[PDB]
Design a protein around this nucleic acid. Sequence first.
RNA 1: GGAGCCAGCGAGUCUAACCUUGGCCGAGAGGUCUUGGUAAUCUUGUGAAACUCCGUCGUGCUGGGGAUAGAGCAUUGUAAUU
Lengths: 122, 69, 141, 114
Amino acid sequence: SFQHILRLLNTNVDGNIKIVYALTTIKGVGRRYSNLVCKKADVDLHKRAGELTQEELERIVQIMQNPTHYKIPAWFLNRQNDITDGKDYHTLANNVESKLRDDLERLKKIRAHRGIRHFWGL
Amino acid sequence: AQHAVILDQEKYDRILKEVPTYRYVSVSVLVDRLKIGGSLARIALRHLEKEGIIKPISKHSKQAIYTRA
Amino acid sequence: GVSVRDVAAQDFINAYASFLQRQGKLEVPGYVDIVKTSSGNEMPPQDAEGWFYKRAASVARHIYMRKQVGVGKLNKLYGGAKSRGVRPYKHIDASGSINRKVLQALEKIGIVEISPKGGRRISENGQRDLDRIAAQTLEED
Amino acid sequence: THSYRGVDLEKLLEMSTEDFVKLAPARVRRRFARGMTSKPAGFMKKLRAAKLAAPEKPAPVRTHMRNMIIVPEMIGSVVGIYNGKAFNQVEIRPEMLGHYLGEFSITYTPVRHG
RNA sequence: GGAGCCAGCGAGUCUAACCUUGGCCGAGAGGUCUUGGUAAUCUUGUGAAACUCCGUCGUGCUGGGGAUAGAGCAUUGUAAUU
């Protein structure tokens, strides 16, 4: 039954830890984001992560990447009012450090001070 | 090694026979000579006291003191 | 006879909060479980369901013992220290939006009423209600 | 194509300034709401004529106005931006929208301990 | 995390706009309509923090620690880009 290791969003998560805290291994999932997602999923916050069933790890993932569908208040999100299109996003896993290392290069292309100083230090 | 955080049937059987042996029991004692994590020990004491196997003398959240009787 | 002053604080409050929740008339704001209750806090309230009832009880008692109170004084009362990172700690007030709705809710069930000279004062029905729970709490001993 | 916060470039250029600010972040909105000074108007007037009479690019107009917001009306102009000492010459590409002019002219020289 | 709950020394507008209670809106920062005080009189019992009680965590750079950095929302100012 109990599984000592699990894998989701291409990240490893160990079962021995409280579910709310275990999830924070994923880039972009902080303590508060993790806490609210669990409540919306109505999982038992006091369970340890290795106890959850597959159809409970789904729904969780299905919320983390669609937060606006469950009326999380948008002011909770880390990519409000995107520069290209005015959508609100939350950035997860390897997608973080791809929008980073992109806005830095976008500044470099336009010869802005902040871009210049950054790459000059490198 | 790591302390256990979920209760297997073997340790449950172990707890019920071993704990009545000790003069003094506390969170620290169960974590030491048994190998459960601290979050189990807080649950075990409330259960064993309710069940009547150990006798309280004082309770303080940050300390607890139970005796053989 | 018995008065609220005859009972220990964190014993009256637990009893009354449990009672008040069972009646189910106390209207909750609905944004509960997102809010931190303070800009000084980290993490939301740990008792996810009950915490709104607990505060409703505390406010009622605090007003009963006093002449009148307003929302601003409650924010000072429930404030705390904020860490401010590497700089030294400082006092910070609690959320206004929580406390304001608490007072509005209690007023609908008639425990509290608006006072002249501003703020809120205990209603005579508030006295009668709280005095009854006090008696039960001692009698349970 | 380039797009600015969901609006396509071909609908820009036709856009007025007071429409543009509705899309802009908080600092820009405050700056215009608090009332931008008269000084940009004199610059814009001169800048407009150089474009209108242009033979094909308008050639530089130069200014000390480092605190001025880039606004779609001035896309494609060539501007010399003062540095406290010299002038640096820059052409307004669409990617520049919403920045300050001062960000494109560096007031100090990198230190090397060489 | 929830609950309990206690000081002393200061300073404040008509020259005009200082210290601000109370009601309403907002997750928050904050906004808005009124009000008392030229003060042992009103803000102010400055209901301060450490602290006390009940829970969660369990010795793992961990839920210790919060530098560096990204996105967004406000306030002062003629002007916040370095």
